[PDB]
Amino acid sequence: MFYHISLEHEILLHPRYFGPNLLNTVKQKLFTEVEGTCTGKYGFVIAVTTIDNIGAGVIQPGRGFVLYPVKYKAIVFRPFKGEVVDAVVTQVNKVGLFTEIGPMSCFISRHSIPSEMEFDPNSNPPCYKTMDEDIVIQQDDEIRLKIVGTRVDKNDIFAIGSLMDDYLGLV
């Protein structure tokens, strides 16, 4: 889910960037540290809108690196537990559907998929189709799923979804 937040990040600036208008270097540095990363607590930081203010630069003793506490406005993608959201299928395997909820990738287990669905390896491309053939989930298909739980791994958020709940599928 997308939100508007005001976060705090301590920027480490080398003394080499102590030239004229050093605040510009701090401002542009913030567009690389917190931009494009994925904090485990607030989720993926997809983009930064604007900068609120830049705090006083405190010089760390011994290290010699000036620390600049800067406040900025950014939009994060935090998948809340037990939240239903649309997803895009990227690949399909016998284990289960592999979905893509925006920046992150969510995996759907075979058990979570309704029993009526049955994986078909012969059909090109693979797609979880039930016997009645009423609903089929191909690749790059807009499907709605509920995230039962989310886990944070290697500075990234991995989500597990399910379609057992009512009205979860192609619609």
Partner: protein, 79 residues
């Protein structure tokens, strides 16, 4: 403003300001004053203090929790 601390600069502040500046100078930091062949980083920072050009601002934390921003140039050094 309304600063109550002594105008002079303490020896401890002078040592840390020069030490931190000297470390910064050794890290390819710019030098405000003109360079006349002084290789040793401490000498570069020492003359910077004499000319009152060090950008470092001393934030003296009072025991009551308040802080005062005293500039190195504003403070009266002893030479």
């Amino acid at each position: 403003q309304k600063r109550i601390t002594t105008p002079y600069m303490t020896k401890y502040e002078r040592a840390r300001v020069l030490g931190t500046r000297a470390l910064q100078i050794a890290m390819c930091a710019p030098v405000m004053v003109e360079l006349e062949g002084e290789t040793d980083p401490l000498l570069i920072a020492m003359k910077e203090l004499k000319a009152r050009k060090i950008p470092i601002i001393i934030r003296r934390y009072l025991p009551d929790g308040s802080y005062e921003d005293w500039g190195v140039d504003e403070l009266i050094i002893s030479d």
